[PDB]
Write a protein of this length. Structure first.
Lengths: 191, 373, 65
């Protein structure tokens, strides 16, 4: 029922070659974003979702579109390469869902961090406070398990939803070969 | 796998820990971390003979991994081939790995460069030349691939050092040095490279700059004390000083290639002297005479005409020759690198020019204000 | 004091000492033209400051100065 413009930040880095998480982390994350996009569309028919990659620098593949077929189709040919630039990717996503189609919609970022983040704590907390001022929620998935912990991510999310904001999230998934869609249950339902 | 790794463990110091780490990475199915570890592994054994046995293990990895960076795969394969010491099996292994990667690109180029380097010691005109030509087009609107560019330019530089194309070697060496923007290379290596580049510049067929070579802020700074005669002769060439060249003859006379090529060096320095004279003379006179050119270049008056004609033909200077009056009217000399004092002089000249422009603008405005308000 | 448009085209630049080939922008001549309707509309709207004086006056202001 709630209007939400949610931009997905997918990680097509070189650590996605790893087969630890089911048939390659790339395919696991493909299924995960499939379920997340379907969940958003089912939650609201007018809800619009987009796609951004976190490759060498960044790349926007599909801006906010109510349909999901184009997003899924573009998801193919997302072959991994390069490192991950979390700060730049999130800033680009922030700009993209600042230039919304409908200003009454809410603003959200679902990020799939399946690789270490090389951004210091200070820059990440600065980004956290800026996004809190701009009223953005960041659902972060600690995919990949390259650190599978508060790899400078729990600080990010807690800074976001500080003072009982309960807006952001950080779902950490173990390397257990279980479908990432099967694992995700917090943001989809109890958002 | 288990017994193979246990038996191979006894090959170098501290190996068991790294072998256990590799086993853990493989079991956890972390292909890329395994790839980084494998790339770092080869550096340990000085002889690097164990790598000659890890061929089977890497084959098994890449068989059902087939996702890891084929660039890194080619790097580790390059190390394995370097360990391997028989050219025929080396060639076959390189061909098979090239077929294996193919689709990746940026690693096929590395494999071709490896083939060229391997075959350079044995036969050039049949493989090396056409391979250098072949690796030319995939390098297209795709810069910053230093990882392959450095190897390619090193191979080309070696080929041109052979054969005897000093100018092409000069171009390729400059390109390699630029591609490896950070230095991070042994001082001995970069010093030898500086010496070779200076010699190639001196002996080149059509390279008269000696203005950016002298100030190359990466190489000439490292030959400043060991072999200073190269820098000294480069300065002499840049300033077109035939007398300094002749005096320094003693220093470079020990170099066999330079000693063999004496007439070419002499003509190059003489042309540089003509250029320097034209540049030094003010623009308003810029009208040299046969006796002056002869005195400056240490050649008789008769050869002045041929020297000036060679300069004009190559394109160093533009002008004409008037034998009746025994003069040369130079109208344009090649641009050269200038220091900060000369830049400030250019700034002052610009100041004069702008002052004149403003004066005339004010004159016209004041005089014609009546018609233009 | 000049035209308001500058045109650039992306081109690959090969150096001799700068070595790496970068993508640089190369200038291209740009001018302003108009169809008949556009010219009519612009001339109608140009009742802000109109001074034709095609003679020596304009040949002194539009150029020289």
């Amino acid at each position: 029922m709630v209007l939400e413009s949610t931009m997905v930040c997918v990680d097509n880095s070189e650590y996605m070659r790893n087969g630890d998480f089911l048939p390659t982390r790339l395919q696991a994350q493909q299924d995960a974003v499939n379920i997340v996009c379907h969940s958003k569309t089912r939650s609201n028919p007018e809800n619009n979702v987009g796609l951004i990659t976190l490759a060498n620098d960044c790349e926007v593949l599909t801006t906010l579109t109510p349909d999901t077929g184009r997003i899924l189709s573009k998801l193919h040919t997302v072959q991994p390469k390069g490192k991950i630039t979390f700060c730049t990717g999130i800033r680009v996503a922030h700009l993209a869902l600042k230039h919304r189609q409908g200003k009454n919609h809410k603003m959200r970022i679902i990020a799939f961090v399946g690789s270490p983040v090389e951004d210091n704590e200070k820059d990440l907390v600065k980004l956290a406070k800026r996004l809190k001022k701009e009223k953005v929620n960041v659902d972060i998935i600690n995919f990949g398990e390259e650190e599978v912990n508060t790899e400078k991510l729990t600080a990010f999310v807690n800074t976001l939803n500080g003072k009982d904001g309960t807006g952001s999230h950080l779902v950490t998934v173990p390397p257990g070969p279980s479908l990432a869609d099967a694992l995700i249950s917090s943001p989809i339902l109890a958002g | 796998v288990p017994g193979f790794l246990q038996q191979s463990q006894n090959s170098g110091p501290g190996q068991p820990a790294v072998w256990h780490r590799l086993e853990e990475l493989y079991t956890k199915k972390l292909w890329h971390q395994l790839t980084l570890q494998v790339l770092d592994f080869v550096q340990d054994p000085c002889f690097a003979q164990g790598d000659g046995l890890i061929k089977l293990y890497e084959n098994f990895i890449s068989e059902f991994e087939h996702r890891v960076n084929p660039l890194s795969l080619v790097e580790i394969i390059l190390h394995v081939v370097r360990q391997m010491t028989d050219p025929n099996v080396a060639l076959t292994f390189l061909e098979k790995t090239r077929e294996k990667v193919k689709s990746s690109d940026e690693a096929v180029i590395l494999c071709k460069t490896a083939i060229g380097a391997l075959k350079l010691n044995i036969g050039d005109l049949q493989v090396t030349k056409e391979t250098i030509e072949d690796v030319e087009e995939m390098l297209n609107n795709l810069p910053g691939v230093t990882s392959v560019h450095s190897r390619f330019y090193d191979l080309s530089s070696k080929y041109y050092q052979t054969i005897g194309n000093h100018a092409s070697y000069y171009k390729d060496a400059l390109r390699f040095l630029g591609c490896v923007d950070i230095k991070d290379l042994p001082v001995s290596e970069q010093q030898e490279r500086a010496f070779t580049l200076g010699l190639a510049g001196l002996l080149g067929e059509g390279v008269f700059n000696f203005g950016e070579l002298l100030m190359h802020p990466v190489l000439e700074s490292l030959r400043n004390t060991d072999r200073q005669w190269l820098i000294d002769t480069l300065y002499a060439f840049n300033s077109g000083n035939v007398e300094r060249f002749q005096t320094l003859k003693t220093a470079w006379g020990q170099q066999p290639d330079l000693a063999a090529n004496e007439a070419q060096l002499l003509r190059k320095i003489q042309l540089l002297c003509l250029m320097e004279m034209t540049f030094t003379r003010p623009a308003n006179h810029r009208q040299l005479t046969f006796e002056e050119i002869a005195k400056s270049a240490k050649i008789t008056v008769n050869e002045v005409e041929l020297l000036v004609m060679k300069a004009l033909s190559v394109g160093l200077v533009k002008g004409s020759i008037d034998e009746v009056d025994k003069r040369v009217h130079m109208t344009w000399v090649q641009p050269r690198v200038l220091d900060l004092q000369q830049i400030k002089g250019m700034k002052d000249r610009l100041e004069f020019w702008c002052t004149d422009v403003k004066s005339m603008e004010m004159l016209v405005e004041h005089q014609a204000h009546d018609i233009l308000t | 004091l000049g035209l308001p448009t500058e045109a650039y085209i992306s081109v690959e630049e090969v150096h001799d000492d700068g070595t790496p080939t970068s993508k640089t922008f190369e200038h291209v001549t740009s001018e302003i033209g108009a169809e008949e309707a556009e010219e009519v509309g612009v001339e109608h709207l140009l009742r802000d400051i109109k001074d034709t004086t095609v003679g020596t006056l304009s040949q002194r202001i539009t150029n020289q100065v």
